[PDB]
Amino acid sequence: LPPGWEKAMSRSSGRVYYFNHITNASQWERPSEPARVRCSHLLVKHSQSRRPSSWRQEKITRTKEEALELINGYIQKIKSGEEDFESLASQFSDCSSAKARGDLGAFSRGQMQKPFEDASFALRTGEMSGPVFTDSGIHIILRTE
Template sequence: MGKDSKAKDSSKAKDPKAKDSKGKGKQADGDEGAGKSQKGGGGKGGGKADGLGTCTYVKARHILCEKQGKINEAYKKLQDGWLDNGDKVPPTEFAKISAEFSECPSGKKGGDLGWFPRGKMAGPFQEVAFSTPVGVTSAPFKSTHGYHIILAEGRKN
């Protein structure tokens, strides 16, 4: 069944289910319940090239700061160590910086959020987490909870 929708037009096949959370998360952070209906099958018929935006689960680490200046400081530390050289930040190094800068309780665990399904996280956080390639660190961004940097560690359906 997923192959049929993929063979036609995967965006049309996913539109009815993805309408509330895909692309609209920025406007309505309170729509968490709407995205939860995708939990079981929102991403099954996606493309196979990179899997971005089509997976059902993401494994990620993050840094959360209330102030933009602090998240920028954390990002600068990531840039100085790896990003300026075009390198990917190793999860262990990202974890150290998360423990140092993050104001989220997960910071004590190196920012590890584990595996989470599409629809669990609100608005921009979900959008960035599900669109960042595995092994890549996102640029800082704002959500209703503060400022974040995400390291995507894995994807699965």
């Protein structure tokens, strides 16, 4: 059982699923440290973000709860295949990295904010996180390398 993964019972169906408390990822299928990882992300900011401002909106007023609902809806569309991660990041991420389809490049430990770093290094290549909270706001993280 890879780092951070636990077994749980779905409320709706009673079927077993798997949850990762470090990445906040969840999935039905049973799952499965590098010096560097490469990640893309989609950031949704809220009124308590350290800098409640982005290229999308000079004053970001949405509540943290409203930001989480936006993040949840993006995760739904990405997982259904209705939308691609990069397309949503390019359009909706509250971050200049949107112009790069969310790409942050490669980094090692000791460079990024702790919740973001821990989730990034707990992901497998190609895997996506659930909502990850930092002082900047709420992130969806995609490990690409």
